[PDB]
Design a protein around this nucleic acid. Structure first.
Lengths: 276, 276, 276, 276, 276, 276
DNA sequence: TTTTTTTT
């Protein structure tokens, strides 16, 4: 367009911002507080940095998918060096079956039933694994319960989505059913801000059974069949011992590589048994 | 008049975006992220791109009709190759009658009876058709229930409208009744804004009874006669097998071509039977 | 006043917009596609365009009124060949009496008793007639029900206001009574703003009995006599089928001229008699 | 201090607009639409006209009040010329006592007891008198019940305030009690906007019973004693003649002159006696 | 730091503001409308005046405390010259004891017990004394029910804050409890704002019963024990007289000077006896 | 990176602001209003100071932690000067055990159980200890129970969080559970603003029971294992002396130094025993 | 050649 001096400066800034992959303020701060202060002083407003971060995020989300961030360069081929393996084996779940299920969920094998739901207390190997998976992926969104006008504000073009425990009201049942269906749909934000959402893997980190439509005090089961047909079931109950947690990304990468190296065709089974 | 460099660059950008048919954000990104970064480095503000997108959308909405870029140019001459045709055959609906109904709905043959209802659960053959309809239209409006102010925050003169079910208050019911009548009504956007909504075809993907008005604990349906008189229906409850899925745009193009080719007289039948 | 260079250009632009008849964006785009190009070559801000539109609308509303152009010179040349006359004779009301009542409503001979009321079944098709009447008038407003903050946003210093269907709460009922009660008064328009209101005709499109003040769940009757003491009682019963509404801008002016050519004395009768 | 050209032109325009004492815009339009269009074309600072109107209103509200502007030019001495005496004669109220009470309320004789309570719908003609007095005073305010955050947004540093009919809630009882006391109280608007309101005369234009403490669902009368002791009473019910009303400023000036010519000492009396 | 023309200009403006104690708009208007108009015509963007007013307010709040605005320059040493003295002695309380209690409360001697329970309706004259105290010092706070959720919008960076009568529901009960405890806390303002409230002198006035914890629909006394533990008791009941009110600031200044002159060691007594 | 005069000035200002650590703007004002006015004169906008405070807070929250502002320099070896020692001696809590527990909680050692729960009435003196702890830490946040839409407004990017007394409503129970888990969660702010919160310790300062989930009208005792095992138990009910509060930071520093001098092995234990 | 803010 202009390719003058300011254009070249902004181009080199975008290059130095996207060469390593930084979309948060703290990341760029820890990378180079010096350049951060220099850019903050060499600008009257704070909209240019926000636009650059948004462009970098859109580029890293459209060009790079999700399984590319789960590739393994060197497997470990061990069963005792991974805590998640022992966690899934203590509940009777098959390792190869769970690996194939995770591979099909991450790479979107089915599409319609792309929803992972858990049952049991969150302090028995749930919140720690969720935090580890959210830290392993550079982009992650969560559906909180604090915002009442729009609970889907922190999930705008993300690689993975998290759904905490909570009996959703009837005003968001259709929205949740359309989000879990897996389709790039257009949703607003608050005021003059509409954006599209691409099919992305979701994980329901709930504690109880949210399939029943529970609105305050009304317990209806009119949408139980579509909810059961659009989601899976991964119920497990086991007292996970303390002095653990905080799963590193190395074990996650190793398990993802083991799942990618062993592809097993899994049929449409809702009630996943505890065999293996 | 002045025809400075800014107006020339704006005209060049308009020509470049209309030469391929890109009036969004992610499409232009995937097309030429390099050119997008160059344009963002050129202009220092963020209102120029907004005005460009606004006038481009206005031109695309106030020029040619939707079927002009939705109809096909090659028939299929088959009934088992397309997934939508197989679904319509298994549902009992006549292919020629459904094609004539779709042709009359797209070209606004009736005007007042511009409603496509989907009675029954959505996970019974409706998901694939809904996905194909949503992916066929480039720019369409949606009515989400997450907005607690205006249900049409993304319907600023679009091609087709997507509708969802749920708890319907009096305001949204009156808005739907005014929209179904086909009238460009000037209504406020959200806050300190207003727009003139143009009569556009709508598609409802309900699950239960959409004619009933349910609000918390109040169930009213006294005005069901005008609602059922100013709307159509398409009840279907056939199971949709897995494996195959995700209908693209070629099937919709072939269906529109077959509808435009074979001309079938459209009747005023509200309660459509399951024969043909 | 200062007499500069931009003032003459702004005056010429205002005169060109007034002579061409451009008050919003729909006609602004439908007139010529080079208007946006000329604007971009001249300046680069939508605030100037919005101010031009605002002052042009203010000039058109202050200099001339609605009956100044609603009654043309070309008559109808046929009393029977008229859709409005046809539906009026089908409803059973008096033609000359209704014409004189409409004439008194247009000139506001009563002040506090000048409000059009439409009551009856929805099978006749009053929505299409209301849409046609609203489209034949360039300056018109409607009561918005989606937001309870500022329900009177499009009817700011307009010529004719339109109402929706159903009931409303007391907070908006009082404002409606103050507006249609024949009293030039100012009220909050937008965010931290105010706008005056002149006794202008209001058309209620409520097909049900709006005299029952229902505040969402409690049905009251203390605001029924003063509500009915501000407009004439109207009640029509007729069942139609198809082919109704969507009239041109010439038949309305022909009917207006035919009604003006026949002046009938009207007293202060509440319910309009169906004799004649 | 600065003494420039733009400041001199702004001061000249301010003096020209305050020379006649007009704070509206329609008067200036009807006077010289040409000069109005010239000033609109010469005003492109989107802040100069706002500051001009702000300082003009501040000068109009800081110099003289409103009742002093309602002084009579010549005494008429005729009970048939003033149309406001017929209502008092029909209702049996004392004309001289009511005139003295109104004169004491306008000149702030009692100080705290400076509020008149009304009782009557549109049939009594109180709304017409209120509209006439509001049109007589060049600047007034009205309480709107449509606002939810701040209902007194259109009543900040005014001359005379009107109270619309409506059951007060718990969120406005304290505000009304603080306003009735008369004090320069600082209150916020809607978002990042605060102002200090001066003790200003208010008057209630309620149609039904308002003194009864009806807060949502709580009906009490314990808080009625302060409202009865902080204001007088003026309840009357009498139907109008044959579309009688339309009072200008000459009648108000004549009434004020007649009240000033014959001043009657009025003590702290709540229930006004009848006789005249 | 460059010492330019605008620098010296706004420095002289801030000096003139802090020399006379002007922090609002009407004060500066009455001080010098000429300079106000000159400054409004000099700069177009209205922000330099608000910044100067905020700086002057912060300077007056940081340099000058609350007791510095209460002590006078000439004592009177008389009991038959102050109206508040007669008001407090009509019940039977001791003047010197109440003066010493007020002096200890204004100096924040206790800290935790910084609230005095004042029982009595509007007939006791609490509103007049509250208005006199609020007008004596240019910085005051009023806990009125005008605001929605956060009524402490005009209490931040102030001195004396007077409460109002109102059944506080489950909204700001915990905030008030933390405020009366004598501890600064960073709390949010109205919306999209936050500020650190410091232990400021507060006086709670209850016309009816406010000590009971009325949370929505539950009337419990769980939070009442610390309430009565961190506050005293001062009940007064006396009917006011006619032609009395509007206490000047000089009376309160002389009262505070006499209180600072003669001091009395105040211990800890809840049920204050009516003697002395 | 350009490195100009304004950039160097902003860099030196940031250096002079973060050389000692400044939180809000009132601290910098009271420190050097001279240089504050100099900086206000060097510029014109009011965003440079905001950006300076923002980056200073970001640096203080990212680089520095919490124990860095909690460690002391030399123990004082006293048993009567400290108040927490007397509190734990009168209640029966173990000195070294509680010291090691607090040291492990402040230095983030447990991870999953990095919280502290308090129980008992507020009349014993917990408010003074909470104020002292909040003053010992520079950056801290509190749960504002006023705004029901988002009570965690001031709890974004803080070293420690405080939880006031209030019922655990189901709309915030899930957010509180996610906060207790300890994960950098991305949540919205107030309007069109989102931020990522890092695992920060929280301290409950309630006086009622937090086991049974009470939502004002409903009560549930089902989901309680995670929220009951993700915290400890430190209750106290012994009342201290009268007017005994306002603790400085020297006592806290001495206690932290004494705890660091003698470290006791901390183990996972909910119901703490009394043995010291 | 110089700039603007939203809900029960």
């Amino acid at each position: 367009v202009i390719r003058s001096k300011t254009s070249a400066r902004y181009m080199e800034l975008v290059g130095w911002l996207v060469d390593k992959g930084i979309t948060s303020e703290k990341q760029w701060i820890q990378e180079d507080q010096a350049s951060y202060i220099s850019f903050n002083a060499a600008s009257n407003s704070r909209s240019q940095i926000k636009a650059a971060l948004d462009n970098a995020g859109k580029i890293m989300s459209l060009t790079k998918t999700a399984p590319d961030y789960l590739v393994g360069q060197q497997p470990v081929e061990d069963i005792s060096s991974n805590r998640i393996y022992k966690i899934l084996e203590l509940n009777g779940y098959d390792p190869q079956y769970a690996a194939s299920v995770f591979l099909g969920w991450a790479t979107k094998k089915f599409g319609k039933r792309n929803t992972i739901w858990l049952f049991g207390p969150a302090t028995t190997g749930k919140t720690n694994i969720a935090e580890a998976i959210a830290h392993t992926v550079p982009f992650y969104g969560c559906v909180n319960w604090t915002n009442e006008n729009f609970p889907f504000n922190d999930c705008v073009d993300k690689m993975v989505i998290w759904w905490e425990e909570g009996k959703m009201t009837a005003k968001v049942v259709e929205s949740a059913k359309a989000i879990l269906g897996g389709s790039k749909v257009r949703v607003d934000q608050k005021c003059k801000s509409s954006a599209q959402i691409d099919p992305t893997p979701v994980i329901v980190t709930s504690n109880t059974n949210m399939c029943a439509v529970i609105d305050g005090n009304s317990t209806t089961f009119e949408h139980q069949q579509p909810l059961q047909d659009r989601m899976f079931k991964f119920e497990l109950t086991r007292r996970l011992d303390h002095d653990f947690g905080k799963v590193t990304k190395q074990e996650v990468k190793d398990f993802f590589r083991w799942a990618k190296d062993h592809v097993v065709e899994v049929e449409h089974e809702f009630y996943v048994k505890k065999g293996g």
